[PDB]
């Protein structure tokens, strides 16, 4: 379904990407964080964790994840933890493995971001 928005309407795909860009900055700019590139800026899990707290109304204690991950393994742990926060919030288990996000799979990343966007468009 989302795969058709991805592959066989590449000017819709870019509009999906431009939609997801506006959405994440609406929230992350509150922390003075800017996203200009969806292909890489969520790969280390940090912005996904911060975004979840912004969307669902909590702070994430800094000992709960790696704010400055120093390894592929720590980035996988961050993404897995963000996936758990997603499930805490009512989303079903995400399809991609956490390593798919760490490896900058644009489809895996936009799928996760799109499911967040479908659920949370209207949060101020």
């Amino acid at each position: 379904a989302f795969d058709t928005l991805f592959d066989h309407a590449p000017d819709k795909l870019n509009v999906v990407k431009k939609t997801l860009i506006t959405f994440v900055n609406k929230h992350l700019n509150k922390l003075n964080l800017e996203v200009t590139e969806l292909e890489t800026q969520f790969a280390d899990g940090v912005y996904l964790v911060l975004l979840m707290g912004l969307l669902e109304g909590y702070f994430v204690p800094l000992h709960s994840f790696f704010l400055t991950p120093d390894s592929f393994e720590q980035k996988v742990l961050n993404v897995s933890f963000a996936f758990e926060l997603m499930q805490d919030g009512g989303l079903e288990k995400p399809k991609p493995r956490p390593e798919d996000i760490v490896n900058c799979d644009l489809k895996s990343t936009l799928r996760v971001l799109y499911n967040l966007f479908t659920k949370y468009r209207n949060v101020e």
């Binding site: 109304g57 909590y58 702070f59 204690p61 994840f65 926060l85 805490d88």
Partner: protein, 271 residues
């Protein structure tokens, strides 16, 4: 046989639903001649391990020996109950938060505010005598309740349980900077609670919600990493300013103990 069977869920009279959120549901009800609040907990991936843990954690909350501590009357074990459930007494004025910030009918005066402060300091000093400390108890204005005679009481029913996510913190404005960043086992938990009391003092002085204009994420990140602090209120006595500054010392080890500020607050009472 088990040492506690807990409260029988079948004996609860559920009267009216008060609230529902991420953590569960609150109901007003009745049980064995008591007017109660029931909290039905929402838990993902409930398990026998988590249920065993719930049943070991709840007995510590049944504290009947201090006027400024509100006990959990008991808990429903799940199984056999549908969900892990807590029972406490209905407090007619609700939380301190509601009395200070959502009080549509009266504004408590500053003599009452100073009495609330003394009440809370006495209850915290008592809780800090327990060995070990009750874990996962966060002091803030939502976790203090106001009883029928306006006595403030620390709510034991508002503790967090081991199976509730430690990664989601919903009242960071009251949390000490070190506790936003370090695991509990790496902090002095008593000194962290004194920071929370300092923020309660600020709230009693300003009658404002701390950092009300910011999201919980913004609050935690800015307090932890950008040095955001409550602004010391203008036009208060040097004595109140001094107390609030020492309770909010950046160095946890320099903050007073609750049993040190109890006599200070006693002298601040009208009576």
């Amino acid at each position: 046989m088990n040492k506690h069977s807990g409260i029988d869920f079948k004996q609860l009279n559920f009267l009216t639903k008060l609230n529902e959120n991420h953590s569960g549901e609150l109901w007003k009800g009745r049980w064995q001649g008591n007017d109660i609040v029931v909290k039905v907990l929402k838990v993902r991936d409930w398990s026998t391990r988590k249920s065993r843990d719930f049943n070991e954690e709840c007995p510590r909350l049944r504290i009947f020996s201090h006027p400024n501590v509100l006990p959990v009357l008991g808990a429903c074990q799940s199984p056999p109950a549908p969900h892990p459930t807590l029972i406490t007494h209905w407090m007619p004025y609700g939380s301190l938060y509601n009395v200070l910030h959502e009080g549509t009918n009266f504004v408590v005066d500053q003599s009452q505010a100073v009495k609330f402060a003394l009440d809370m300091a006495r209850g915290m000093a008592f809780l800090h005598t327990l060995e070990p400390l009750i874990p996962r108890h966060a002091l803030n204005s939502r976790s203090v309740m106001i009883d029928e005679d306006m006595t403030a009481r620390i709510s034991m029913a508002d503790v967090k349980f081991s199976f509730q996510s430690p990664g989601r913190m919903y009242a960071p404005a009251w949390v000490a900077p070190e506790a936003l960043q370090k695991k509990p086992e790496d902090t002095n938990r008593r000194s962290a609670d004194m920071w929370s009391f300092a923020v309660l003092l600020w709230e009693l002085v300003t009658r404002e919600v701390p950092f009300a204009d910011l999201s919980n994420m913004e609050i935690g990140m800015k307090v932890a990493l950008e040095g955001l602090r409550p602004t010391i209120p203008p036009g208060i006595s040097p004595h109140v300013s001094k107390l609030m500054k020492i309770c909010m010392n950046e160095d946890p080890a320099k903050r007073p103990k609750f049993d040190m500020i109890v006599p200070i607050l006693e002298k601040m009472q009208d009576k």
